[PDB]
Write a protein that binds this ligand. Structure first.
Ligand code: FES
Ligand code: FES
Lengths: 13, 183, 233, 281, 174, 94
RNA sequence: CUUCUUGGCGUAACGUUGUGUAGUUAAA
RNA sequence: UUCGUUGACUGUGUUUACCACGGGGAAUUAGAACAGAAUAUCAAGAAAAA
RNA sequence: GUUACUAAACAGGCCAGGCCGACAAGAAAAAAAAAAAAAAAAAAA
């Protein structure tokens, strides 16, 4: 199953 | 009427003069802040590297040996406390109330107008009373001077230790005469 | 360990009342879960002479000498050293140039032990229903040890407790056993020794050190009391 | 004399900031309430008398006495108290090093100090007594032997001998006397506290029963009368059941009429916690 | 000679306090929403008063305390209330959840309940919560349209306008 | 036992372990002394600062005698970790 | 092994706008 | 401890509780991002045979 | 799921519009002891 993304994956890298 | 505690200057004349005399004040302050060597400039040293190295070595040895020695006493005290609390817990609920009251217990004071007798510590049980003569005979010159000064300052602090016992009424005055006095 | 009546005594009343209650007492007893409540007193005499450890003396003397060399010690001015009080004693060296005895074994600690017949134990008394353990201890002192013997009590709380269950025949009488609470006390120096009151259940008394205690008291009682007894090897 | 009609001293005036005059800053909530924060009183606004010999010279004399006795005695007393309050059960011996193999610590004070990273300088600063309450407490229990002699030495003139030469076995005597002489009941105060509360002894469940001998059966029997078993249970365990009528009136009925059914306040306060001794398992 | 009070007509107090809850149970809120309005001023004999204003509520899970002691939300979720028997006060919590349809079978999660400690309050919030952030859940009929427009433009916008395009919802998990 | 503890003769290894030592919490400069320090550095108590040694030994009633006294952490040599002991062995040799 | 704190206090919170003082324009 | 410190900062982003409007101003969010500077606090220290 | 806002009358009365560059902001740390006694220093950090 897919998983929700963490705080790291939401920063403007 | 109702009275309030007080200590008039006349009954304590000694300490007032002691603290108002400039030279005695200077001596007391020097004793408090001894030594009086300066500590502001960088060049102010009251010791030397070798001197304080030897002092540190001696202090470390002393602390190590004292910790090695007193640890057995500490363990024994821990065991004794465990036993005491176990016994108190084993006591019945009727005796619980008395078994937690400490030596100095006394019923509350009433301002009217298991406790058989007042608590009084035998003066013969004080450590310095039991071993006063031996320690005094084994003291040094500086220690004797220290004891003398300690005595004299104790007396200065408490000129009326016996007078309070003898005539306690001299230290209680009415409100209407106490509250009307400036500081 | 063995308090049996044969080893305790035969043909007496007050002594056997405490340990067996075979001659029933004249007062009301106090049971806690079927065990009679008793207070035990453990009076001690502190050493009469003072001993100081070498490391303490060495540290103190070295500090005094170091302070003298470095000129960092206390001032202690003459104006605060000499002001003519009745207790004044100081004077500069320059001006000077111009088994029942309390005195036994003064370098150790002693404990007062009591002989109930052939058994060596500590003073013991029963608690009468409704009275304080302090009152029980006072009665113990005044009736078993000496009418004028009043050692200093260290507190209202016991320092240890012990239990003893009676045999089948004795427990059939309605009392399962006796539970004892021990209390420490100090023999005030300069106070008179014991003087056994007439009719007191005590047969004899002694003042023994910790080392000699096991030579007289049973290992069970020693185990019960050693946790609270002071440390001295 | 000793017996006297003492006057109740007037309360000391707690200062206040000259602000917030229209609000009630003296709610009875506990610091630090998230929704009822307490207004602080700055130390610079607490009214204090000007310094004279009664408050300053006495402090100087007590400080000189402490100097003569040595700050090491005060440090040792504080350390002994702190270690005693935390080592009331048998501990395993603790060394201060992972490989010393011979050095012993000297108390759980070591564990506490390591855990809190306590300030070596801070202990000396405390022992030097920079605060009024500290000097006042030294004037009262300053004696080294206080755990066993309390304030009896507060005026003794040879008291410094204890500080100078009370060590080893004598320190052990002081501690053993103090453990038996200290209080072990409930403390009752409304003032704030933030430290580990001193121990309160647990209380046993059963009480003691009085028994007297009866020769008619040659056995010991209870002193108290029989009563019905239900009455015995009510007297021993409590009211029984989850609900009962209130206590019957013990005073003669009032001649006048009063609305005794009315509660004291429209909105009663919250229940108070049980601060008394706990039971024994 | 009657002293007319200053708060007589026409100079009475225009705006009333309006102290109390401003969001009911199960309502959806986001950070910054004032759950309860409260004031710092306190009456001089509070323990004798009876009006409900004087007795404040207490923050709980995902709730802050304001300068004037307002209780405000800190996460996207649904409101829940609890009763503290020990302190005899009401506690405001927010269970974190993403926007989705509020079903009848899920209403029990927002019941007001009795607790003895804030630890038990946190435990109950965890037990009633729907899902955790790190695992998420299958959203049941989540919204898909942009949010309501700013108040100063229009006060009476339409929720989930079918004429508007679908836009991603990437703010309600924070 | 107690007798052996009273008669204890500390070995030189034990004395070295009991050697006191200053560990610096943070970087800082002395205002009046101008000394420069780095956090985590280890020094001997005797030579680290004489003015601070005054308070640490009992010949000063002021805790501000050394301007960076609060940045000190006084530990015994035996308590230090192996890494720090090896790293600063040279400056702690006495 | 992401990050232990932080842009006052204020249970009366300062008079909005304007004028004046002051700030900004290698751009706006 | 008699302990530091000045975040009682400089800016970009028009999103947000309340609501006639004005004074987001009885005194709402990390608009959880971004560009600078500053202050305080680290962590680890495991293993004591027969 | 869920009971909470709400003082109109010249109704029964309240108001001091102010303090703080810091023991008043404030990191870390610390913080107030039953009864009785001693002391008569309005004293927790
Ligand atoms: S200070 Fe009281 S007997 Fe030592
Ligand atoms: S480091 Fe310079 S005076 Fe202490």
């Amino acid at each position: 199953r897919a998983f929700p993304r963490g705080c790291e994956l939401k920063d403007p890298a | 009427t109702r009275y309030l505690p007080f200590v008039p200057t006349s009954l304590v004349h000694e300490t007032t003069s002691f603290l108002h005399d400039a030279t005695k004040l200077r001596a007391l302050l020097a004793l408090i802040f001894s030594p009086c060597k300066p500590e502001a400039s960088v060049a102010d040293e009251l010791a030397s590297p070798a001197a304080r190295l030897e002092f540190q070595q001696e202090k470390e040895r002393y602390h190590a040996i004292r910790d090695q020695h007193t640890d057995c006493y500490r363990r024994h005290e821990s065991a004794a406390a465990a036993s005491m609390w176990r016994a108190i817990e084993a006591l019945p609920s009727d005796l619980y109330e008395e078994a937690v009251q400490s030596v100095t217990f006394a019923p509350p004071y009433e301002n009217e107008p298991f406790y058989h007798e007042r608590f009084a510590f035998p003066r013969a049980l004080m450590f310095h009373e039991m071993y006063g003569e031996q320690i005094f005979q084994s003291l040094s010159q500086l220690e004797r001077r220290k004891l003398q000064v300690f005595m004299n300052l104790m007396h200065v602090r408490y000129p009326h230790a016996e007078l309070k016992r003898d005539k306690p009424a001299l230290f209680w005055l009415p409100e209407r005469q106490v509250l009307s006095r400036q500081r | 360990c063995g308090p049996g009546s044969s080893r305790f005594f035969s043909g007496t009343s007050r002594r056997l009342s405490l340990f067996f209650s075979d001659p029933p007492p004249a007062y009301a007893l106090s049971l806690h879960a079927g065990y009679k409540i008793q207070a035990a007193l453990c009076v001690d005499r502190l050493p009469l002479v003072y001993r100081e450890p070498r490391y303490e003396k060495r540290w103190r003397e070295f500090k005094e000498q170091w302070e003298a060399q470095t000129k960092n010690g206390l001032t202690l001015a003459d104006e605060i050293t000499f002001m003519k009080f009745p207790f004044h004693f100081f004077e500069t060296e320059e001006a000077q140039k111009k088994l029942r005895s309390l005195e036994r074994e003064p370098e150790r600690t002693l404990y007062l032990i009591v002989r109930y017949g052939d058994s060596w134990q500590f003073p013991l008394e029963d608690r009468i229903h409704g009275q304080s353990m302090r009152s029980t201890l006072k009665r113990l002192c005044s009736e078993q040890l000496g009418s004028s013997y009043a050692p200093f009590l260290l507190g209202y709380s016991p320092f240890s407790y012990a239990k003893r269950t009676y045999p089948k025949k004795t427990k059939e009488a309605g009392i399962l056993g006796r539970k004892i609470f021990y209390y420490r006390a100090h023999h005030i120096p300069g106070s008179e020794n014991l003087k056994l009151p007439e009719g007191s259940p005590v047969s004899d008394f002694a003042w023994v050190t910790l080392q000699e205690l096991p030579a007289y008291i049973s290992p069970r009682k020693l185990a019960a009391v050693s946790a609270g007894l002071l440390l001295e090897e | 004399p000793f017996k006297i009609f003492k006057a109740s001293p007037p309360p000391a005036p707690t200062g206040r900031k000259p602000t917030g005059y229209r609000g009630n800053h003296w709610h009875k909530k506990v610091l630090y309430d998230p929704v009822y924060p307490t207004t602080k009183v700055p130390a610079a606004l607490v009214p204090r008398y000007p310094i004279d010999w009664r408050n300053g010279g006495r402090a100087l004399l007590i400080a000189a006495l402490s100097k003569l006795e040595g700050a090491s005695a005060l440090q040792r007393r504080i350390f002994l108290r702190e270690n005693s309050r935390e080592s009331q059960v048998p501990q395993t011996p603790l060394s201060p090093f992972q490989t010393g193999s011979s050095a012993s610590g000297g108390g759980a004070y070591l564990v506490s100090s390591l855990g809190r990273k306590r300030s070596y300088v801070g202990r000396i600063a405390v022992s030097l007594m920079p605060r009024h309450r500290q000097i006042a407490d030294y004037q009262r229990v300053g004696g080294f032997c206080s755990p066993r002699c309390f304030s009896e030495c507060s005026k003794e003139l040879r008291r410094c001998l204890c500080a100078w030469r009370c060590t080893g076995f004598h320190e052990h005597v002081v501690q053993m006397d103090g453990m038996l002489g200290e209080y072990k009941g409930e403390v009752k105060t409304e003032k704030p506290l933030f430290s580990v509360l001193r121990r309160q002894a647990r209380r046993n469940a059963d009480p003691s029963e009085g028994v007297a001998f009866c020769a008619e059966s040659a056995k010991f029997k209870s002193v108290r009368r029989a009563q019905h078993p239900a009455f015995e249970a009510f007297d021993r365990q409590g009211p029984d059941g989850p609900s009962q009528k209130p206590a019957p009136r013990k005073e003669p009925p009032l001649p006048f009429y009063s609305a005794s059914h009315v509660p004291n306040v429209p909105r009663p306060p919250p229940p108070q916690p049980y601060t008394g001794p706990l039971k024994v398992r | 000679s009657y002293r007319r009070p200053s708060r007589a007509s026409p100079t009475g107090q225009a705006r009333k306090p309006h102290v109390g809850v401003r969001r009911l149970a199960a309502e959806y809120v986001w950070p910054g929403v004032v759950l309860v309005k409260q004031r710092k001023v306190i009456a001089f004999n509070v323990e004798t008063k009876r009006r409900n204003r004087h007795f404040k509520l207490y923050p709980g899970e995902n709730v802050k305390v304001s300068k004037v002691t307002n209780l405000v939300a800190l996460c996207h979720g649904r409101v829940k209330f609890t009763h503290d028997v020990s302190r005899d006060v009401l506690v405001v919590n927010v269970l974190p959840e993403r926007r989705e349809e509020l079903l009848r079978e899920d209403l029990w999660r927002y019941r007001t309940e009795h607790v003895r400690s804030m630890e038990e309050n946190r435990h109950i919030c965890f037990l009633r919560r729907k899902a955790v952030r790190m695992f998420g859940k299958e959203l049941v009929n989540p919204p898909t349209k942009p949010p309501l427009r700013p108040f100063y433009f229009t006060k009476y916008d339409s929720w989930e306008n079918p004429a508007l395009p679908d836009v991603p919802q990437l703010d309600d998990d924070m | 036992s107690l007798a052996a503890a009273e008669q204890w003769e500390p070995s030189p290894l034990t004395l070295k372990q009991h050697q006191q030592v200053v560990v610096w919490k943070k970087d800082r400069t002395c205002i009046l002394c101008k000394k420069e320090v780095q956090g985590g550095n280890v020094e001997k108590v005797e030579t680290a600062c004489e003015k601070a040694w005054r308070f640490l030994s009992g010949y000063s009633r002021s805790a501000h005698v050394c301007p960076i006294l609060p940045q000190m952490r006084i530990l015994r040599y035996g308590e230090l970790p192996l890494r720090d002991r090896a790293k600063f062995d040279a400056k702690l040799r006495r």
